[PDB]
Amino acid sequence: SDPVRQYLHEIGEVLELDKWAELGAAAKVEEGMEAIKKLSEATGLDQELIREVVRAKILGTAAIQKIPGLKEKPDPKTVEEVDGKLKSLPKELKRYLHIAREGEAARQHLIEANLRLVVSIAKKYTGRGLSFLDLIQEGNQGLIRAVEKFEYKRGFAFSTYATWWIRQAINRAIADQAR
């Protein structure tokens, strides 16, 4: 059945989260990136290289793995070996590996929750040259930029912040033919 109809279904079943819950996921995400920085400083690997591999594992068991607009699945081989240079670390270092993961699983739950918030926003930009799908792909990347640039360390809502990014990402994408 039309792949897009499939996706709309899959995110329909996703449970929306409350205010603090989304900030509880952001604070966990940065604590996970504080832990990558360390796993980096040890193993010697590029921070991002570690991120994508950890995300690789977590994404392993997510309800939604194929998200439109997102470059999923790093080299399965590259993951194979990065697992090694990791899961063979000191007693003390294995700890920052669980935190790395919890901050990445958090990032996924924080993304999954706001996929519908994205379908809705995109529903208001149709008939402007870009198909529904193309909008979802620009929105999602707008959602990605949002989860990343967010400061959990302040009493602001994620749903509100995120909206902006999803917004001007979509209307930047329909401004990339026109203005």
PDB file of C-alpha atoms in Angstrom:
ATOM      1  CA  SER A   1       0.000   0.000   0.000  1.00  0.00           C
ATOM      2  CA  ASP A   2       1.317   3.468  -0.851  1.00  0.00           C
ATOM      3  CA  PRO A   3       4.442   3.761   1.349  1.00  0.00           C
ATOM      4  CA  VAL A   4       3.315   7.217   2.578  1.00  0.00           C
ATOM      5  CA  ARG A   5      -0.015   5.821   3.768  1.00  0.00           C
ATOM      6  CA  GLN A   6       2.056   3.259   5.689  1.00  0.00           C
ATOM      7  CA  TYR A   7       4.129   5.927   7.418  1.00  0.00           C
ATOM      8  CA  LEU A   8       1.086   7.997   8.348  1.00  0.00           C
ATOM      9  CA  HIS A   9      -0.313   4.876   9.990  1.00  0.00           C
ATOM     10  CA  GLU A  10       2.879   4.010  11.880  1.00  0.00           C
ATOM     11  CA  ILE A  11       3.198   7.448  13.494  1.00  0.00           C
ATOM     12  CA  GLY A  12      -0.511   7.426  14.287  1.00  0.00           C
ATOM     13  CA  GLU A  13       0.131   4.766  16.932  1.00  0.00           C
ATOM     14  CA  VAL A  14       2.894   6.788  18.594  1.00  0.00           C
ATOM     15  CA  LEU A  15       2.090   8.117  22.055  1.00  0.00           C
ATOM     16  CA  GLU A  16       2.302  11.889  22.502  1.00  0.00           C
ATOM     17  CA  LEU A  17       4.374  13.037  25.502  1.00  0.00           C
ATOM     18  CA  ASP A  18       3.891  15.767  28.134  1.00  0.00           C
ATOM     19  CA  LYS A  19       5.900  18.945  28.807  1.00  0.00           C
ATOM     20  CA  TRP A  20       8.537  17.757  31.312  1.00  0.00           C
ATOM     21  CA  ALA A  21       8.760  14.365  29.584  1.00  0.00           C
ATOM     22  CA  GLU A  22      10.234  16.005  26.496  1.00  0.00           C
ATOM     23  CA  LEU A  23      12.661  18.025  28.637  1.00  0.00           C
ATOM     24  CA  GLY A  24      13.494  14.847  30.530  1.00  0.00           C
ATOM     25  CA  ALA A  25      14.494  13.418  27.166  1.00  0.00           C
ATOM     26  CA  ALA A  26      16.572  16.464  26.182  1.00  0.00           C
ATOM     27  CA  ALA A  27      18.485  16.464  29.477  1.00  0.00           C
ATOM     28  CA  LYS A  28      19.139  12.755  28.924  1.00  0.00           C
ATOM     29  CA  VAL A  29      20.265  13.410  25.354  1.00  0.00           C
ATOM     30  CA  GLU A  30      22.941  15.908  26.385  1.00  0.00           C
ATOM     31  CA  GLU A  31      24.048  13.636  29.212  1.00  0.00           C
ATOM     32  CA  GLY A  32      24.494  11.038  26.476  1.00  0.00           C
ATOM     33  CA  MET A  33      26.559  13.414  24.346  1.00  0.00           C
ATOM     34  CA  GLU A  34      28.590  14.375  27.390  1.00  0.00           C
ATOM     35  CA  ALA A  35      29.303  10.643  27.521  1.00  0.00           C
ATOM     36  CA  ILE A  36      30.198  10.370  23.838  1.00  0.00           C
ATOM     37  CA  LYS A  37      32.756  13.156  24.212  1.00  0.00           C
ATOM     38  CA  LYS A  38      34.377  10.953  26.832  1.00  0.00           C
ATOM     39  CA  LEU A  39      34.089   7.699  24.857  1.00  0.00           C
ATOM     40  CA  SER A  40      35.770   9.741  22.115  1.00  0.00           C
ATOM     41  CA  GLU A  41      38.546  11.081  24.366  1.00  0.00           C
ATOM     42  CA  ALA A  42      39.312   7.440  25.185  1.00  0.00           C
ATOM     43  CA  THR A  43      38.744   5.153  22.197  1.00  0.00           C
ATOM     44  CA  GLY A  44      40.188   7.928  20.018  1.00  0.00           C
ATOM     45  CA  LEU A  45      37.243   7.960  17.628  1.00  0.00           C
ATOM     46  CA  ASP A  46      35.450  10.927  16.091  1.00  0.00           C
ATOM     47  CA  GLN A  47      32.535  12.011  18.291  1.00  0.00           C
ATOM     48  CA  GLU A  48      30.014  11.808  15.461  1.00  0.00           C
ATOM     49  CA  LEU A  49      31.365   8.404  14.426  1.00  0.00           C
ATOM     50  CA  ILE A  50      30.494   7.169  17.916  1.00  0.00           C
ATOM     51  CA  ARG A  51      27.082   8.884  17.879  1.00  0.00           C
ATOM     52  CA  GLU A  52      25.951   7.235  14.611  1.00  0.00           C
ATOM     53  CA  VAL A  53      27.068   3.811  15.840  1.00  0.00           C
ATOM     54  CA  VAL A  54      25.269   4.120  19.174  1.00  0.00           C
ATOM     55  CA  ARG A  55      22.208   5.461  17.387  1.00  0.00           C
ATOM     56  CA  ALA A  56      22.720   2.457  15.105  1.00  0.00           C
ATOM     57  CA  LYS A  57      22.148   0.079  18.031  1.00  0.00           C
ATOM     58  CA  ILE A  58      19.213   1.928  19.601  1.00  0.00           C
ATOM     59  CA  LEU A  59      17.512   2.389  16.231  1.00  0.00           C
ATOM     60  CA  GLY A  60      17.833  -1.380  16.121  1.00  0.00           C
ATOM     61  CA  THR A  61      14.719  -1.720  18.319  1.00  0.00           C
ATOM     62  CA  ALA A  62      12.750   1.463  17.604  1.00  0.00           C
ATOM     63  CA  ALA A  63       9.089   1.375  16.603  1.00  0.00           C
ATOM     64  CA  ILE A  64       9.909   3.691  13.702  1.00  0.00           C
ATOM     65  CA  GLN A  65      13.254   3.114  11.998  1.00  0.00           C
ATOM     66  CA  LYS A  66      12.691   4.369   8.451  1.00  0.00           C
ATOM     67  CA  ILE A  67      12.023   8.077   8.991  1.00  0.00           C
ATOM     68  CA  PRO A  68      11.629  10.196   5.804  1.00  0.00           C
ATOM     69  CA  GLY A  69      14.334  12.830   5.404  1.00  0.00           C
ATOM     70  CA  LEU A  70      16.841  10.976   7.563  1.00  0.00           C
ATOM     71  CA  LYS A  71      19.955   9.116   6.367  1.00  0.00           C
ATOM     72  CA  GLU A  72      19.568   5.855   8.316  1.00  0.00           C
ATOM     73  CA  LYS A  73      21.951   2.915   8.742  1.00  0.00           C
ATOM     74  CA  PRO A  74      25.689   3.683   8.739  1.00  0.00           C
ATOM     75  CA  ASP A  75      27.934   0.995   7.205  1.00  0.00           C
ATOM     76  CA  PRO A  76      26.867  -2.221   9.007  1.00  0.00           C
ATOM     77  CA  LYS A  77      30.517  -3.210   8.752  1.00  0.00           C
ATOM     78  CA  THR A  78      31.620   0.113  10.245  1.00  0.00           C
ATOM     79  CA  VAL A  79      29.253  -0.551  13.128  1.00  0.00           C
ATOM     80  CA  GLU A  80      30.553  -4.108  13.527  1.00  0.00           C
ATOM     81  CA  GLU A  81      34.050  -2.797  14.206  1.00  0.00           C
ATOM     82  CA  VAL A  82      33.145   0.334  16.192  1.00  0.00           C
ATOM     83  CA  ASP A  83      31.205  -1.910  18.577  1.00  0.00           C
ATOM     84  CA  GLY A  84      34.492  -3.724  19.150  1.00  0.00           C
ATOM     85  CA  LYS A  85      36.780  -0.780  19.921  1.00  0.00           C
ATOM     86  CA  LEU A  86      34.003   0.189  22.364  1.00  0.00           C
ATOM     87  CA  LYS A  87      32.653  -2.933  24.071  1.00  0.00           C
ATOM     88  CA  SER A  88      36.269  -3.693  24.957  1.00  0.00           C
ATOM     89  CA  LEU A  89      36.826  -0.788  27.339  1.00  0.00           C
ATOM     90  CA  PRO A  90      37.949  -0.330  30.980  1.00  0.00           C
ATOM     91  CA  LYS A  91      35.703  -1.133  33.922  1.00  0.00           C
ATOM     92  CA  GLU A  92      35.087   2.582  34.501  1.00  0.00           C
ATOM     93  CA  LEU A  93      34.482   3.402  30.828  1.00  0.00           C
ATOM     94  CA  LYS A  94      31.664   0.926  30.169  1.00  0.00           C
ATOM     95  CA  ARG A  95      29.531   3.220  32.350  1.00  0.00           C
ATOM     96  CA  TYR A  96      29.581   6.174  29.941  1.00  0.00           C
ATOM     97  CA  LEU A  97      28.485   3.690  27.264  1.00  0.00           C
ATOM     98  CA  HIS A  98      25.136   3.004  28.896  1.00  0.00           C
ATOM     99  CA  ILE A  99      24.658   6.765  29.350  1.00  0.00           C
ATOM    100  CA  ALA A 100      25.626   7.210  25.700  1.00  0.00           C
ATOM    101  CA  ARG A 101      22.819   4.822  24.787  1.00  0.00           C
ATOM    102  CA  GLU A 102      20.177   6.212  27.174  1.00  0.00           C
ATOM    103  CA  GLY A 103      20.786   9.635  25.633  1.00  0.00           C
ATOM    104  CA  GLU A 104      20.348   8.186  22.161  1.00  0.00           C
ATOM    105  CA  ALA A 105      17.249   6.136  22.930  1.00  0.00           C
ATOM    106  CA  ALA A 106      15.937   9.339  24.486  1.00  0.00           C
ATOM    107  CA  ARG A 107      16.701  11.242  21.269  1.00  0.00           C
ATOM    108  CA  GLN A 108      14.734   8.618  19.318  1.00  0.00           C
ATOM    109  CA  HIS A 109      11.712   8.715  21.602  1.00  0.00           C
ATOM    110  CA  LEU A 110      11.918  12.521  21.461  1.00  0.00           C
ATOM    111  CA  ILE A 111      11.867  12.290  17.666  1.00  0.00           C
ATOM    112  CA  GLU A 112       9.183   9.622  17.338  1.00  0.00           C
ATOM    113  CA  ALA A 113       6.856  11.593  19.614  1.00  0.00           C
ATOM    114  CA  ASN A 114       6.990  14.678  17.396  1.00  0.00           C
ATOM    115  CA  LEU A 115       6.575  13.008  13.993  1.00  0.00           C
ATOM    116  CA  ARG A 116       2.842  13.776  13.948  1.00  0.00           C
ATOM    117  CA  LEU A 117       3.433  17.379  15.013  1.00  0.00           C
ATOM    118  CA  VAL A 118       5.346  17.383  11.713  1.00  0.00           C
ATOM    119  CA  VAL A 119       2.685  15.743   9.529  1.00  0.00           C
ATOM    120  CA  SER A 120       0.247  18.368  10.797  1.00  0.00           C
ATOM    121  CA  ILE A 121       2.467  21.369  10.064  1.00  0.00           C
ATOM    122  CA  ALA A 122       3.223  20.050   6.573  1.00  0.00           C
ATOM    123  CA  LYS A 123      -0.527  19.652   6.036  1.00  0.00           C
ATOM    124  CA  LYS A 124      -0.593  23.465   5.880  1.00  0.00           C
ATOM    125  CA  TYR A 125       1.936  23.861   3.059  1.00  0.00           C
ATOM    126  CA  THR A 126       0.434  21.540   0.446  1.00  0.00           C
ATOM    127  CA  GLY A 127      -0.608  22.784  -2.997  1.00  0.00           C
ATOM    128  CA  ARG A 128       2.516  24.970  -3.151  1.00  0.00           C
ATOM    129  CA  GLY A 129       4.454  22.860  -5.641  1.00  0.00           C
ATOM    130  CA  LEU A 130       5.783  20.372  -3.113  1.00  0.00           C
ATOM    131  CA  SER A 131       4.091  17.018  -2.570  1.00  0.00           C
ATOM    132  CA  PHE A 132       3.008  15.916   0.912  1.00  0.00           C
ATOM    133  CA  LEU A 133       5.995  13.555   1.170  1.00  0.00           C
ATOM    134  CA  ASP A 134       8.572  16.190   0.181  1.00  0.00           C
ATOM    135  CA  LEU A 135       7.198  18.424   2.935  1.00  0.00           C
ATOM    136  CA  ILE A 136       7.407  15.658   5.538  1.00  0.00           C
ATOM    137  CA  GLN A 137      11.053  15.138   4.593  1.00  0.00           C
ATOM    138  CA  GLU A 138      11.827  18.831   5.067  1.00  0.00           C
ATOM    139  CA  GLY A 139       9.821  18.975   8.280  1.00  0.00           C
ATOM    140  CA  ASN A 140      11.546  15.925   9.756  1.00  0.00           C
ATOM    141  CA  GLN A 141      14.972  17.417   9.100  1.00  0.00           C
ATOM    142  CA  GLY A 142      13.528  20.527  10.712  1.00  0.00           C
ATOM    143  CA  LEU A 143      12.663  18.320  13.689  1.00  0.00           C
ATOM    144  CA  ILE A 144      16.190  16.903  13.698  1.00  0.00           C
ATOM    145  CA  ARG A 145      17.754  20.370  13.747  1.00  0.00           C
ATOM    146  CA  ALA A 146      15.389  21.162  16.626  1.00  0.00           C
ATOM    147  CA  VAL A 147      16.247  18.274  18.952  1.00  0.00           C
ATOM    148  CA  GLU A 148      19.913  19.145  18.354  1.00  0.00           C
ATOM    149  CA  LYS A 149      19.923  22.914  18.963  1.00  0.00           C
ATOM    150  CA  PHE A 150      17.634  22.636  22.004  1.00  0.00           C
ATOM    151  CA  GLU A 151      18.715  23.767  25.479  1.00  0.00           C
ATOM    152  CA  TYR A 152      17.140  21.471  28.075  1.00  0.00           C
ATOM    153  CA  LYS A 153      18.682  23.723  30.721  1.00  0.00           C
ATOM    154  CA  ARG A 154      15.772  26.173  30.446  1.00  0.00           C
ATOM    155  CA  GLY A 155      12.066  26.186  31.320  1.00  0.00           C
ATOM    156  CA  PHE A 156      10.776  26.230  27.753  1.00  0.00           C
ATOM    157  CA  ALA A 157       8.587  23.651  25.998  1.00  0.00           C
ATOM    158  CA  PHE A 158      10.012  21.459  23.238  1.00  0.00           C
ATOM    159  CA  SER A 159       6.817  21.302  21.170  1.00  0.00           C
ATOM    160  CA  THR A 160       6.864  25.091  20.826  1.00  0.00           C
ATOM    161  CA  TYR A 161      10.547  25.398  19.914  1.00  0.00           C
ATOM    162  CA  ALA A 162      10.387  22.438  17.522  1.00  0.00           C
ATOM    163  CA  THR A 163       7.417  23.937  15.678  1.00  0.00           C
ATOM    164  CA  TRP A 164       9.532  26.894  14.560  1.00  0.00           C
ATOM    165  CA  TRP A 165      12.290  24.706  13.095  1.00  0.00           C
ATOM    166  CA  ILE A 166       9.868  22.397  11.316  1.00  0.00           C
ATOM    167  CA  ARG A 167       8.180  25.560  10.047  1.00  0.00           C
ATOM    168  CA  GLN A 168      10.980  27.591   8.464  1.00  0.00           C
ATOM    169  CA  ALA A 169      12.606  24.356   7.257  1.00  0.00           C
ATOM    170  CA  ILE A 170       9.500  23.581   5.225  1.00  0.00           C
ATOM    171  CA  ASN A 171       9.072  27.131   3.910  1.00  0.00           C
ATOM    172  CA  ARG A 172      12.825  27.291   3.222  1.00  0.00           C
ATOM    173  CA  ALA A 173      12.387  24.188   1.094  1.00  0.00           C
ATOM    174  CA  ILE A 174       9.546  25.793  -0.869  1.00  0.00           C
ATOM    175  CA  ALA A 175      11.650  28.944  -1.030  1.00  0.00           C
ATOM    176  CA  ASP A 176      14.388  26.969  -2.776  1.00  0.00           C
ATOM    177  CA  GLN A 177      12.694  27.267  -6.147  1.00  0.00           C
ATOM    178  CA  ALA A 178      10.994  30.591  -5.926  1.00  0.00           C
ATOM    179  CA  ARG A 179      11.452  33.646  -3.656  1.00  0.00           C
TER     180      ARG A 179
END
